[PDB]
Ligand binder design. Sequence first.
Ligand SMILES: COc1cccc2c1C(=O)c1c(O)c3c(c(O)c1C2=O)C[C@@](O)(C(=O)CO)C[C@@H]3O[C@H]1C[C@H](N)[C@H](O)[C@H](C)O1
Ligand SMILES: [Mg+2]
Ligand SMILES: [Mg+2]
Ligand SMILES: [Mg+2]
Ligand SMILES: [Mg+2]
Ligand SMILES: [Mg+2]
Lengths: 167, 167
Amino acid sequence: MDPLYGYFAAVAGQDGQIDADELQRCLTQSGIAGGYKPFNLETCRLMVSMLDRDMSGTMGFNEFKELWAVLNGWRQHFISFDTDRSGTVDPQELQKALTTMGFRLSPQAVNSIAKRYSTNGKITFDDYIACCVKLRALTDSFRRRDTAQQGVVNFPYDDFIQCVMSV
Amino acid sequence: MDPLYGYFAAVAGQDGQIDADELQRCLTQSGIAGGYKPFNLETCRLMVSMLDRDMSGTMGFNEFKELWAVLNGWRQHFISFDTDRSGTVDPQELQKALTTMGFRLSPQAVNSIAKRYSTNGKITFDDYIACCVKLRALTDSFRRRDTAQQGVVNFPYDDFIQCVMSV
Ligand SMILES: COc1cccc2c1C(=O)c1c(O)c3c(c(O)c1C2=O)C[C@@](O)(C(=O)CO)C[C@@H]3O[C@H]1C[C@H](N)[C@H](O)[C@H](C)O1
Ligand SMILES: [Mg+2]
Ligand SMILES: [Mg+2]
Ligand SMILES: [Mg+2]
Ligand SMILES: [Mg+2]
Ligand SMILES: [Mg+2]
């Protein structure tokens, strides 16, 4: 028996599967939230999107074990940039946190990411994770259309929507 | 002159310019929502960044006027398929609604949208807008970069991300 099984277990027992609504309950039950403002649902939608890989709208347990790790990894990397444990982070001190944990972008590119997600000036922990989660799946999408291994991908119109809207 | 000024006037004189928290209000104040539930703020950042080239987190009244009209039209098509007055519409009903209002999307593409934005087999009115919103701002970005005029645009990894994280 894995410890993370139980949180996942009690929510949606038979399918062996959880959607965003099911996912949200069991994350914050297990305290990956970890003191901070517990994950709201439209964040959890992306997490599901990221990891289903079949358009199921759901992810099973070993897909769930995988997630908990990524969010722990990212949770601590947040706590570095807000050791006061307020909830928040200013956009510029966020700017570095973005660059650090990998696969990063230029000072001109990074701003775009902190411009959009800046909620009343500050950035929330929920906004932070939700940004990471959105990008990971965008990298992982870009990856799989970049069969050439270049870092430059041709996008048709219908393909570009079909891609971007799924995440 | 214009009846839409009062609703807008009430919400902000930041300059003569509103944010999402304000926009949310004046929409529901104007009752474009129209029986259905107020457009929630998760949607109403899209509505800013859709018509915000200058990354301010703001739109103005003349931009607003565009928005309200697009919605008044979009809303109408929804209410074709929702003679219920329910706030819910099936993902076939959605697929056809996307066609009739002028989107060049394939069988495979709208499937991949409809799948995503559905949650228990039907789509909320709020969701249908945020789907429709997202389309029209991503296609405006694709046509912004398609001065190739081909139906194909080519994307660096640092450009592809900074495109999709703005919306
Ligand atoms: C999210 O991860 C990825 C997933 C799939 C493909 C990619 C990447 C990726 O991160 C990536 C890069 O970070 C870089 C490049 C790249 O092609 C990719 C991917 O293709 C080259 C680069 O010049 C580009 O601007 C083009 O994207 C800059 C950068 O170079 C970095 C990493 C290079 N491998 C090399 O070590 C160079 C010296 O620094
Ligand atoms: Mg799955
Ligand atoms: Mg701080
Ligand atoms: Mg305000
Ligand atoms: Mg503007
Ligand atoms: Mg119906």
